[PDB]
Design a protein around this ligand. Structure first.
Ligand SMILES: O=C(O)c1cc(SCCc2ccccc2)ccc1NS(=O)(=O)c1ccc2ccccc2c1
Ligand SMILES: O=C(O)c1cc(SCCc2ccccc2)ccc1NS(=O)(=O)c1ccc2ccccc2c1
Length: 146
């Protein structure tokens, strides 16, 4: 699907840029604009939620490939319950970037791509309809202008 591929490209490229060293660009203007937006906001979110992010990472206890494949079950239970807003969407991806950083530390680089797939699957399978209503990643750029 077009929306899934767009979301997978934005989240993967951001997770790779944070955990490793980007970028080898590819996609359209909206994906390029959304990556820039998420780069600006994501830096601030990872700093402001640093303590929460560290505590949540400690709970998941990731050390092997099996642990990242199980993360999806915890993420869908938290992200589904409650209100849906752009703030919660960026913080979920920003947490993913923080997990991707930890994955580079524990020498599990090959798990960043399935982690990016996991977050995209959590975001799309839970909020696809809300995303279509907000004009997808175009609404994401418009909401995070300031
Ligand atoms: O998440 C873990 O893997 C975890 C492992 C051991 C202890 C607590 C944990 N987590 S926890 O943060 O205390 C918690 C517990 C239950 C929840 C049920 C629904 C939604 C959120 C929840 C959060
Ligand atoms: O926006 C989210 O819904 C959100 C979800 C995730 S998925 C990792 C889930 C997890 C929970 C508990 C322990 C380990 C992992 C990551 C970052 C997020 N950031 S958040 O906006 O700061 C937030 C919101 C509600 C929460 C309710 C209970 C516990 C934590 C929460 C965090």
């Amino acid at each position: 699907d077009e929306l899934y591929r767009q979301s997978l490209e934005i989240i993967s490229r951001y997770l790779r840029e944070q955990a490793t060293g980007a970028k080898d660009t590819r996609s359209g203007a909206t994906s390029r604009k959304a990556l820039e937006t998420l780069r600006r906001v994501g830096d601030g979110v990872q700093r402001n939620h640093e303590t929460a992010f560290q505590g949540m990472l400690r709970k998941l206890d990731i050390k092997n490939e099996d642990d990242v494949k199980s993360l999806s079950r915890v993420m869908i239970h938290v992200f589904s319950d409650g209100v849906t807003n752009w703030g919660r969407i960026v913080t979920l991806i920003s947490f993913g970037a923080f997990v991707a950083k930890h994955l580079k530390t524990i020498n599990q680089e090959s798990c960043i791509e399935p982690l990016a797939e996991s977050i995209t699957d959590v975001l799309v399978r839970t909020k696809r309809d809300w995303l279509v209503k907000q004009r997808g990643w175009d609404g994401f750029v418009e909401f995070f202008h300031v």
